[PDB]
Write an enzyme that holds these catalytic residues in place. Structure first.
Site, PDB file in Angstrom:
ATOM      1  CG  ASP A  88      -2.172   1.070   0.886  1.00  0.00           C
ATOM      2  OD1 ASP A  88      -2.303   1.307  -0.020  1.00  0.00           O
ATOM      3  OD2 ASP A  88      -2.845   1.378   1.816  1.00  0.00           O
ATOM      4  CG  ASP A  92      -8.995 -11.910   6.482  1.00  0.00           C
ATOM      5  OD1 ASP A  92      -8.464 -11.410   5.361  1.00  0.00           O
ATOM      6  OD2 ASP A  92      -8.808 -13.063   6.757  1.00  0.00           O
TER       7      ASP A  92
END
Ligand SMILES: Nc1ncnc2c1ncn2[C@@H]1O[C@H](COP(=O)(O)OP(=O)(O)O)[C@@H](O)[C@H]1O
Ligand SMILES: [Ca+2]
Ligand SMILES: [Mg+2]
Ligand code: NA
Length: 315
Positions: free
Chosen positions: A152, A179
């Site tokens: 990222d 998640d």
């Protein structure tokens, strides 16, 4: 490329010495000073750890999950205690409290490059040369010492300070957190490489594209996709597309590039090699480290701290 300066080694030593005195982090030991920034994953506050008197940046991720999941997340983030480099934001610890996961790190008084950019209009090439060095060295460290890839890279994930330090933050280390977060949380995909957007190649090369794209935005002062017309360019240096369309553009169109004439050919070449669509042809970390732009910048005596403080009004 991971060797440590004398001043650097000393700064890392001090940081750990301080961290050692902290002890277990607890919700009640923190006092809010102010908000540093937000996102659709969590908020970040500048805080004071009362007992130690240490100032930190505390990121809060509101999550409604069982005691099992959170305890696993906290376990996964413990990996952050081992990531110690002059190019990686310092980590203090993580804990859970009343529905929120807390991630405490070293506070970077200069904020993120997205904030600096907003204030500067555009960031000078020589300054971006130092930023480039930091990012490459940060990615090299993660890949080398922890076999980790950022995943990222983007302007809001590069932090700076009045000491002239440039560090990476927010690199995924906890699969479980990802998640649980993937739910009501989703960060921008606008900096993802074409291969990652195609479910194809997924490696460090992908972070190199993100860096290259971030550098162009900062150099020109605007997210570079789609490219600026001849009209915009003339007003920039004298000299809205939906997210899904943006992602398609990235995958199907030629990569962005810096305008010619205003930037050195070495800088243009460097970004070009970072932005090659084919991950195989794209330069790798080893190659970037010795690119003419990096060699030149590394040798330049640039007062980044001085530029930074004057730009954001620190000072
Ligand atoms: N250690 C830190 N020091 C100073 N500011 C920070 C620190 N960590 C995060 N921030 C600020 O908080 C903002 C929000 O962070 P984050 O929750 O990760 O969202 P995003 O990266 O999408 O902006 C960042 O953009 C940055 O300005
Ligand atoms: Ca409490
Ligand atoms: Mg972030
Ligand atoms: Na609290």
């Amino acid at each position: 490329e991971l060797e440590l300066d004398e001043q650097q080694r000393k700064r890392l030593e001090a940081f750990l010495t301080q961290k050692q005195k902290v002890g277990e982090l607890k919700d009640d030991d923190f006092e809010k000073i102010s908000e540093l920034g937000a996102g659709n994953g969590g908020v970040v506050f500048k805080v004071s750890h009362k007992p130690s008197g240490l100032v930190m940046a505390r990121k809060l991720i509101h999550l409604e999950i069982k005691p099992a999941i959170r305890n696993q997340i906290i376990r996964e983030l413990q990996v952050l205690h081992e990531c110690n480099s002059p190019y990686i934001v310092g980590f203090y610890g993580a804990f859970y409290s009343d529905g929120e996961i807390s991630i405490c790190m070293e506070h970077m008084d200069g904020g993120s490059l997205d904030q600096v950019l907003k204030k500067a209009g555009r960031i000078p090439e020589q300054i971006l040369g130092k930023v480039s060095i930091a990012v490459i060295k940060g990615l090299t460290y993660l890949r080398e010492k922890h076999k980790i890839m950022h995943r990222d890279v983007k302007p809001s994930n590069i932090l700076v300070n009045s000491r002239g330090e440039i560090k990476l933050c927010d690199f995924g280390v906890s699969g479980q957190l990802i998640d649980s977060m993937a739910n009501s949380f989703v960060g921008t995909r606008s900096y993802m490489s074409p291969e990652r957007l195609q479910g194809t190649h997924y490696s460090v090369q992908s972070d190199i594209w993100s860096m290259g794209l971030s550098l162009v935005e900062m150099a020109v002062g605007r997210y570079p996709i789609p490219p600026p017309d001849a009209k915009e360019l003339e007003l920039m240096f004298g000299c809205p597309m939906a997210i899904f369309e943006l992602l398609d553009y990235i995958v199907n169109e030629p990569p962005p590039k810096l305008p010619s004439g205003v930037f050195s050919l070495e800088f243009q070449d460097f970004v070009n090699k970072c932005l090659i669509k084919n991950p195989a042809e794209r330069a790798d970390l080893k190659q970037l480290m010795v690119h003419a732009f990096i060699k030149r910048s590394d040798a330049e005596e640039v007062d980044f701290a001085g530029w930074l403080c004057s730009t954001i009004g620190l000072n």
